[PDB]
PDB file of C-alpha atoms and ligand atoms in Angstrom:
ATOM      1  CA  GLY A 228      24.112 -57.615  42.877  1.00 51.43           C
ATOM      2  CA  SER A 229      21.639 -59.251  45.250  1.00 51.27           C
ATOM      3  CA  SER A 230      18.902 -56.950  43.567  1.00 51.42           C
ATOM      4  CA  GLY A 231      18.780 -59.439  40.793  1.00 53.30           C
ATOM      5  CA  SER A 232      22.103 -59.811  38.591  1.00 53.76           C
ATOM      6  CA  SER A 233      25.781 -60.476  38.722  1.00 55.59           C
ATOM      7  CA  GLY A 234      26.662 -59.429  35.059  1.00 51.71           C
ATOM      8  CA  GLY A 235      26.591 -63.054  33.369  1.00 54.61           C
ATOM      9  CA  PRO A 236      27.202 -66.664  33.872  1.00 54.44           C
ATOM     10  CA  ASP A 237      31.015 -66.136  33.166  1.00 53.85           C
ATOM     11  CA  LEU A 238      33.768 -66.558  35.857  1.00 52.96           C
ATOM     12  CA  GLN A 239      35.875 -63.389  35.071  1.00 56.25           C
ATOM     13  CA  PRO A 240      37.800 -61.419  37.959  1.00 57.58           C
ATOM     14  CA  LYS A 241      35.726 -59.202  40.441  1.00 58.67           C
ATOM     15  CA  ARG A 242      38.585 -56.951  41.946  1.00 56.18           C
ATOM     16  CA  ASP A 243      39.450 -54.812  38.846  1.00 53.09           C
ATOM     17  CA  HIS A 244      38.471 -51.664  41.119  1.00 55.24           C
ATOM     18  CA  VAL A 245      40.808 -52.805  43.865  1.00 56.48           C
ATOM     19  CA  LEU A 246      44.558 -52.075  44.802  1.00 52.27           C
ATOM     20  CA  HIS A 247      47.326 -53.384  46.985  1.00 49.27           C
ATOM     21  CA  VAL A 248      49.357 -51.078  48.934  1.00 50.14           C
ATOM     22  CA  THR A 249      52.694 -51.362  50.905  1.00 50.48           C
ATOM     23  CA  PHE A 250      54.178 -48.960  53.344  1.00 53.19           C
ATOM     24  CA  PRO A 251      56.335 -48.817  56.583  1.00 49.34           C
ATOM     25  CA  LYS A 252      54.754 -50.359  59.871  1.00 48.68           C
ATOM     26  CA  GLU A 253      54.232 -46.762  61.233  1.00 50.70           C
ATOM     27  CA  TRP A 254      51.680 -45.926  58.733  1.00 49.60           C
ATOM     28  CA  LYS A 255      47.867 -45.917  59.731  1.00 49.36           C
ATOM     29  CA  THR A 256      44.429 -45.843  58.377  1.00 51.85           C
ATOM     30  CA  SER A 257      44.377 -41.954  58.448  1.00 50.42           C
ATOM     31  CA  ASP A 258      47.626 -41.671  56.283  1.00 52.49           C
ATOM     32  CA  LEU A 259      45.773 -44.293  53.815  1.00 53.91           C
ATOM     33  CA  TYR A 260      42.556 -41.904  53.872  1.00 51.58           C
ATOM     34  CA  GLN A 261      44.960 -38.867  53.090  1.00 50.39           C
ATOM     35  CA  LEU A 262      46.823 -40.656  50.231  1.00 49.86           C
ATOM     36  CA  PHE A 263      43.652 -41.903  48.404  1.00 46.41           C
ATOM     37  CA  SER A 264      41.581 -38.527  49.336  1.00 46.99           C
ATOM     38  CA  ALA A 265      42.438 -37.740  45.422  1.00 44.78           C
ATOM     39  CA  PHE A 266      39.697 -40.373  44.630  1.00 48.64           C
ATOM     40  CA  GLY A 267      36.781 -39.375  47.102  1.00 45.94           C
ATOM     41  CA  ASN A 268      35.209 -42.151  49.253  1.00 48.44           C
ATOM     42  CA  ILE A 269      37.093 -45.579  49.539  1.00 49.34           C
ATOM     43  CA  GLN A 270      37.165 -48.892  51.568  1.00 49.22           C
ATOM     44  CA  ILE A 271      40.328 -50.377  53.249  1.00 50.61           C
ATOM     45  CA  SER A 272      41.042 -54.130  54.058  1.00 53.02           C
ATOM     46  CA  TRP A 273      44.359 -54.793  56.256  1.00 52.80           C
ATOM     47  CA  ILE A 274      46.422 -58.081  55.547  1.00 50.99           C
ATOM     48  CA  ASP A 275      49.672 -57.112  57.441  1.00 53.09           C
ATOM     49  CA  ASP A 276      51.633 -54.700  59.470  1.00 52.08           C
ATOM     50  CA  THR A 277      53.008 -53.125  56.290  1.00 50.77           C
ATOM     51  CA  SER A 278      50.271 -53.903  53.537  1.00 53.92           C
ATOM     52  CA  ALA A 279      46.518 -53.769  52.862  1.00 57.12           C
ATOM     53  CA  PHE A 280      43.974 -53.669  50.113  1.00 57.75           C
ATOM     54  CA  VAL A 281      42.020 -50.294  48.950  1.00 55.95           C
ATOM     55  CA  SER A 282      38.910 -50.252  47.060  1.00 57.52           C
ATOM     56  CA  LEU A 283      38.190 -47.426  44.467  1.00 60.15           C
ATOM     57  CA  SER A 284      34.905 -46.550  42.796  1.00 58.96           C
ATOM     58  CA  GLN A 285      36.363 -46.829  39.066  1.00 57.16           C
ATOM     59  CA  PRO A 286      39.070 -48.742  37.302  1.00 57.21           C
ATOM     60  CA  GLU A 287      40.210 -45.462  35.852  1.00 54.46           C
ATOM     61  CA  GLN A 288      41.200 -44.441  39.298  1.00 55.66           C
ATOM     62  CA  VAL A 289      42.931 -47.719  39.927  1.00 58.93           C
ATOM     63  CA  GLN A 290      44.878 -46.907  36.461  1.00 57.65           C
ATOM     64  CA  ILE A 291      45.858 -43.300  37.755  1.00 60.68           C
ATOM     65  CA  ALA A 292      46.892 -44.688  41.179  1.00 59.83           C
ATOM     66  CA  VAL A 293      49.196 -47.326  39.503  1.00 62.39           C
ATOM     67  CA  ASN A 294      50.646 -44.829  37.167  1.00 60.23           C
ATOM     68  CA  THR A 295      51.242 -42.107  39.978  1.00 60.66           C
ATOM     69  CA  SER A 296      52.755 -44.594  42.576  1.00 57.96           C
ATOM     70  CA  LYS A 297      55.930 -44.809  40.330  1.00 59.86           C
ATOM     71  CA  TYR A 298      57.090 -41.474  41.957  1.00 61.83           C
ATOM     72  CA  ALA A 299      56.344 -42.442  45.512  1.00 62.23           C
ATOM     73  CA  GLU A 300      59.292 -43.037  48.109  1.00 63.71           C
ATOM     74  CA  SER A 301      57.594 -43.597  51.292  1.00 61.98           C
ATOM     75  CA  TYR A 302      54.740 -46.149  49.898  1.00 61.96           C
ATOM     76  CA  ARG A 303      54.031 -48.118  46.788  1.00 59.63           C
ATOM     77  CA  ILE A 304      50.671 -49.158  44.983  1.00 60.77           C
ATOM     78  CA  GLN A 305      49.762 -51.938  42.456  1.00 59.68           C
ATOM     79  CA  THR A 306      46.427 -53.726  41.451  1.00 61.28           C
ATOM     80  CA  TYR A 307      44.791 -56.684  43.118  1.00 59.50           C
ATOM     81  CA  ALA A 308      45.666 -58.757  39.984  1.00 57.54           C
ATOM     82  CA  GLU A 309      49.348 -57.677  40.398  1.00 52.92           C
ATOM     83  CA  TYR A 310      49.210 -58.858  44.077  1.00 52.68           C
ATOM     84  CA  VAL A 311      47.885 -62.189  43.013  1.00 51.14           C
ATOM     85  CA  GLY A 312      50.422 -62.576  40.103  1.00 47.73           C
ATOM     86  CA  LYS A 313      53.332 -61.958  42.615  1.00 50.99           C
ATOM     87  CA  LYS A 314      52.032 -64.334  45.386  1.00 50.08           C
ATOM     88  CA  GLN A 315      55.248 -66.287  44.916  1.00 50.12           C
ATOM     89  CA  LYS A 316      56.907 -63.643  46.958  1.00 52.18           C
ATOM     90  CA  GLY A 317      60.096 -65.538  47.808  1.00 51.83           C
ATOM     91  CA  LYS A 318      60.850 -63.038  50.813  1.00 50.63           C
ATOM     92  CA  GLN A 319      64.083 -64.774  52.216  1.00 49.46           C
ATOM     93  CA  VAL A 320      66.409 -67.276  50.995  1.00 48.88           C
ATOM     94  CA  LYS A 321      68.656 -68.357  54.070  1.00 50.73           C
ATOM     95  CA  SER A 322      66.406 -71.566  54.124  1.00 48.71           C
ATOM     96  CA  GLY A 323      63.220 -70.429  52.472  1.00 51.10           C
ATOM     97  CA  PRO A 324      59.863 -68.533  52.996  1.00 50.82           C
ATOM     98  CA  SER A 325      58.816 -71.496  55.173  1.00 50.88           C
ATOM     99  CA  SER A 326      61.538 -70.233  57.622  1.00 49.53           C
ATOM    100  CA  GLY A 327      61.439 -66.440  57.414  1.00 49.83           C
TER     101      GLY A 327
HETATM  102  C1  LIG B 635      44.429 -50.371  62.862  1.00 47.95           C
HETATM  103  N1  LIG B 635      45.716 -50.972  62.139  1.00 47.95           N
HETATM  104  C2  LIG B 635      45.576 -52.597  62.182  1.00 47.95           C
HETATM  105  N2  LIG B 635      46.798 -52.945  61.414  1.00 47.95           N
HETATM  106  C3  LIG B 635      46.965 -54.254  60.879  1.00 47.95           C
HETATM  107  O1  LIG B 635      45.842 -54.676  60.414  1.00 47.95           O
HETATM  108  C4  LIG B 635      45.378 -55.981  61.081  1.00 47.95           C
HETATM  109  C5  LIG B 635      43.778 -55.944  61.393  1.00 47.95           C
HETATM  110  O2  LIG B 635      43.321 -54.946  62.030  1.00 47.95           O
HETATM  111  P1  LIG B 635      41.737 -54.742  62.194  1.00 47.95           P
HETATM  112  O3  LIG B 635      41.121 -54.649  60.957  1.00 47.95           O
HETATM  113  O4  LIG B 635      41.384 -53.614  63.161  1.00 47.95           O
HETATM  114  O5  LIG B 635      41.162 -56.132  63.133  1.00 47.95           O
HETATM  115  P2  LIG B 635      41.254 -56.381  64.446  1.00 47.95           P
HETATM  116  O6  LIG B 635      40.069 -55.932  65.069  1.00 47.95           O
HETATM  117  O7  LIG B 635      41.177 -58.016  64.315  1.00 47.95           O
HETATM  118  O8  LIG B 635      42.537 -56.004  65.006  1.00 47.95           O
HETATM  119  P3  LIG B 635      43.083 -56.359  66.272  1.00 47.95           P
HETATM  120  O9  LIG B 635      42.196 -56.784  67.239  1.00 47.95           O
HETATM  121  O10 LIG B 635      44.289 -57.377  65.891  1.00 47.95           O
HETATM  122  O11 LIG B 635      44.008 -55.117  66.944  1.00 47.95           O
HETATM  123  C6  LIG B 635      44.896 -54.178  66.127  1.00 47.95           C
HETATM  124  C7  LIG B 635      46.108 -54.705  65.767  1.00 47.95           C
HETATM  125  O12 LIG B 635      46.842 -53.929  64.890  1.00 47.95           O
HETATM  126  C8  LIG B 635      48.030 -53.249  65.496  1.00 47.95           C
HETATM  127  N3  LIG B 635      48.255 -51.894  65.188  1.00 47.95           N
HETATM  128  C9  LIG B 635      47.328 -50.784  65.330  1.00 47.95           C
HETATM  129  N4  LIG B 635      47.692 -49.758  64.849  1.00 47.95           N
HETATM  130  C10 LIG B 635      48.952 -50.003  64.320  1.00 47.95           C
HETATM  131  C11 LIG B 635      49.998 -49.208  63.697  1.00 47.95           C
HETATM  132  O13 LIG B 635      50.104 -48.047  63.557  1.00 47.95           O
HETATM  133  N5  LIG B 635      51.029 -50.015  63.177  1.00 47.95           N
HETATM  134  C12 LIG B 635      51.214 -51.286  63.368  1.00 47.95           C
HETATM  135  N6  LIG B 635      52.190 -51.842  62.676  1.00 47.95           N
HETATM  136  N7  LIG B 635      50.058 -52.161  63.963  1.00 47.95           N
HETATM  137  C13 LIG B 635      49.109 -51.448  64.313  1.00 47.95           C
HETATM  138  C14 LIG B 635      47.869 -53.522  66.975  1.00 47.95           C
HETATM  139  O14 LIG B 635      49.065 -53.366  67.686  1.00 47.95           O
HETATM  140  C15 LIG B 635      46.965 -54.819  66.974  1.00 47.95           C
HETATM  141  O15 LIG B 635      47.972 -55.847  66.985  1.00 47.95           O
HETATM  142  C16 LIG B 635      46.204 -55.917  62.365  1.00 47.95           C
HETATM  143  O16 LIG B 635      46.325 -57.252  63.127  1.00 47.95           O
HETATM  144  C17 LIG B 635      47.563 -55.278  62.005  1.00 47.95           C
HETATM  145  O17 LIG B 635      48.393 -56.144  61.262  1.00 47.95           O
HETATM  146  C18 LIG B 635      47.485 -51.935  61.217  1.00 47.95           C
HETATM  147  N8  LIG B 635      48.790 -51.761  60.650  1.00 47.95           N
HETATM  148  C19 LIG B 635      49.128 -50.644  60.450  1.00 47.95           C
HETATM  149  N9  LIG B 635      50.326 -50.491  59.976  1.00 47.95           N
HETATM  150  N10 LIG B 635      48.542 -49.487  60.747  1.00 47.95           N
HETATM  151  C20 LIG B 635      47.393 -49.501  61.411  1.00 47.95           C
HETATM  152  O18 LIG B 635      46.938 -48.392  61.794  1.00 47.95           O
HETATM  153  C21 LIG B 635      46.702 -50.818  61.710  1.00 47.95           C
END
């Protein structure tokens, strides 16, 4: 990093070790630390009442969390790149996402 290098002059993604997580509005930072305790130390960055980003120390841990979330029924997990690739959310259709 700021020590003297960024990996190269290329413009590839920088979030391959980061997840996006979706949950009921009653979930807390403590439930998130409990969910991701399987991967050691982490970092958490909110974006709504019902979703946040979560950083992990390896992309292998990201792949394991994305595989294991298929069995969850009180939360769900995807990569940062999946969240970006689904940004066209289309949440409601009564008039449009501009109105709900
Ligand atoms: C602790 N939180 C926070 N949030 C959601 O994340 C948003 C950003 O929070 P934060 O990073 O702490 O930044 P701020 O210092 O800017 O926070 P702010 O002064 O707005 O005060 C906190 C807000 O978050 C709400 N909040 C706290 N605890 C809960 C909770 O259990 N559920 C919900 N749904 N909201 C909570 C407060 O009422 C206040 O408005 C933040 O704006 C919010 O969207 C959050 N979301 C969940 N589900 N759980 C949490 O533990 C938190």
